[PDB]
C-alpha cells in the first residue's frame, strides 16, 4: 500500500489569493498522481491528471507541480466557487490510495445574520411533538452562538443545529437551530426566545414569540 500524506488539513484564503496544497507520497510514483475536487454532497471531480495536465473543462487557474514523491496543487487566484475539499490520488500501483483531504475555506469580510424564528406547525402539534426552528441567513464567519430562552429560562441540551456550506457566490453561511420539545412542555410555557451572538452584531440579537 502506498501512503499519501496531505498538508495542510484546513486553510482559509481570500478571493484572488494564491493557494498552495502539499501532497506527499511514501515512495516515488513519477508523474502518476491525480488531483480531484469534491464539493460537499457531490461526487469528486477530476482536476489534474498525469501530475500537471489540466483535464478538459477545468479552468486555467488550477495548476499542479511535482514528480516522484513530493507534489503541489496551486490555485493562482481563488474564486468563491473554488470552495471544496481537494484529494490527491496515486495512480502507479495497486492498491489505489487517496490523500487525507484538504478543506479550502474562503475568507471574507464580516457579514451579519438576519434572524428568523418559526413556531411549531399545527400539523406537528397533532402528533404530540413541538419543534421551534431558528434560522440565521447569509452571514460570516461560520462561528456563531445560538442560545434558547423559554420564559426567560436558559435552555440547554435539547436543541440541534446544522450549517450550510459557503455560498458559491457571496461566501456566506446559513444556520438552522432546531429546539424540539414534547407538546406537553410546549403548552406549559409562554415565551420562546432565540438569542444570537455573532461577530457581525454589536450586541446580541433576540427573536422571540410567546403564544405556546
Amino acid at each position: 500500500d502506498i501512503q499519501m500524506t496531505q498538508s495542510p488539513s484546513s486553510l482559509s484564503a481570500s478571493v484572488g489569493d494564491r493557494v498552495t496544497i502539499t501532497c506527499r507520497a511514501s515512495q516515488s510514483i513519477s508523474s502518476y498522481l491525480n488531483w480531484y475536487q469534491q464539493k460537499p454532497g457531490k461526487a469528486p471531480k477530476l482536476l489534474i491528471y498525469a501530475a500537471s495536465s489540466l483535464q478538459s473543462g477545468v479552468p486555467s487557474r488550477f495548476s499542479g507541480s511535482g514528480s516522484g514523491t513530493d507534489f503541489t496543487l496551486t490555485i493562482s487566484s481563488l474564486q468563491p466557487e473554488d470552495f471544496a475539499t481537494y484529494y490527491c490520488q496515486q495512480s502507479y500501483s495497486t492498491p489505489l490510495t487517496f490523500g487525507g483531504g484538504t478543506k479550502v475555506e474562503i475568507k471574507r469580510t464580516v457579514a451579519a445574520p438576519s434572524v428568523f424564528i418559526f413556531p411549531p406547525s399545527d400539523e406537528q402539534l397533532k402528533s404530540g411533538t413541538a419543534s421551534v426552528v431558528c434560522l440565521l441567513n447569509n452571514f460570516y464567519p461560520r462561528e456563531a452562538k445560538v442560545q434558547w430562552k423559554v420564559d426567560n429560562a436558559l435552555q440547554s441540551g435539547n436543541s440541534q443545529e446544522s450549517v450550510t456550506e459557503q455560498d458559491s457566490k457571496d461566501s456566506t453561511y446559513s444556520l438552522s437551530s432546531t429546539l424540539t420539545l414534547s407538546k406537553a412542555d410546549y403548552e406549559k410555557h409562554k415565551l420562546y426566545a432565540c438569542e444570537v451572538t455573532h461577530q457581525g452584531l454589536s450586541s446580541p440579537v433576540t427573536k422571540s414569540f410567546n403564544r405556546g
Binding site: P44, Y87, F116, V133, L135, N137, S162, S174
Partner: protein, 230 residues
C-alpha cells in the same frame, strides 16, 4: 456525453451482502480497457478505493476488502455491479462508481449512493411546514420552508415547486436526533410582497422508504380569533 448512475438498496442488515449496480448510458463498456471501478467514502472521512474490473473480467481488489468483494460485468445490459458480503457498521458509506480511463484515472464518476448498515427498519419522514409570518420576516424579505423530521436512513432530497424555484433556497445537512433518526430543514428566502399571491410547495423524496410527499406552504393562519372581512 457519458453518464454513470448508481442504484441498489441503501440499507443492509449486518453480516449480509451488499448489492450495487452502476449503469453506463451514453457510451459503451467496450473500449479496450476502461477500468470500471468502485470507490466508497465514509461520512466525514476520506476516500477509499475498493477495486476494479475491466473488459477481460480480471479483477484487482483492495487487500482489506479481499474475499469480501466481487465485481462483475454484464455487457449485454451495459452494467457492472459490486457485491460486498458480511457487512459491518464500518462499511456504512457513500459508494461511487467511476471509470478509470486513458491518461491518469477516474475521469467520470457516478452520482453516488449511500448505504447505511443497520439492523433497524426503514422509517419514512414526516413533513411539517415552516410557515412564513411577521416574525419570519426581517426587512424586505421573508423566510419560509419545510421541516423534514424523523426519518431513516439517509438521504432525502427536497425541491421547491418541482425545481422551478432555486434562487434563495437553503437545504440544511441532516443531523442525528437524540433518539436515532435523521432530520433536516429546507428553507427559502422570498420578498415579503409575494406572500399572499405566490404558491410555495416543497417536494420531499425518501427513496429508502419509497415515500414522496408534497406539502404546500402557506402564510401562517393564526386562529386565536381575529376579525375577518368578506
Amino acid at each position: 456525453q457519458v453518464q454513470l448512475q448508481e442504484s441498489g438498496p441503501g440499507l443492509v442488515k449486518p453480516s449480509e451482502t451488499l448489492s450495487l449496480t452502476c449503469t453506463v448510458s451514453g457510451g459503451s463498456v467496450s473500449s479496450g480497457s476502461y477500468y470500471w471501478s468502485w470507490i466508497r467514502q465514509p461520512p466525514g472521512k476520506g476516500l477509499e478505493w475498493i477495486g476494479y474490473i475491466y473488459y477481460s473480467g480480471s479483477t484487482n481488489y483492495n487487500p482489506s476488502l479481499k474475499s469480501r468483494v466481487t465485481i462483475s460485468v454484464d455487457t449485454s445490459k451495459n452494467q457492472f455491479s459490486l457485491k460486498l458480503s458480511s457487512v459491518t457498521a464500518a462499511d456504512t458509506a457513500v459508494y461511487y462508481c467511476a471509470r478509470e480511463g486513458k491518461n491518469g484515472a477516474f475521469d467520470i464518476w457516478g452520482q453516488g449512493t449511500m448505504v447505511t448498515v443497520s439492523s433497524a427498519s426503514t422509517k419514512g419522514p414526516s413533513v411539517f411546514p415552516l410557515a412564513p409570518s411577521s416574525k419570519s420576516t426581517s426587512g424586505g424579505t421573508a423566510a419560509l420552508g419545510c421541516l423534514v423530521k424523523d426519518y431513516f436512513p439517509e438521504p432525502v432530497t427536497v425541491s421547491w415547486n418541482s425545481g422551478a424555484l432555486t434562487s434563495g433556497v437553503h437545504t440544511f445537512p441532516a443531523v442525528l436526533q437524540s433518539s436515532g433518526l435523521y432530520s433536516l430543514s429546507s428553507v427559502v428566502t422570498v420578498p415579503s410582497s409575494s406572500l399572499g399571491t405566490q404558491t410555495y410547495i416543497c417536494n420531499v423524496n425518501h427513496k429508502p422508504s419509497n415515500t414522496k410527499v408534497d406539502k404546500k406552504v402557506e402564510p401562517k393562519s393564526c386562529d386565536k380569533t381575529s376579525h375577518h372581512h368578506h
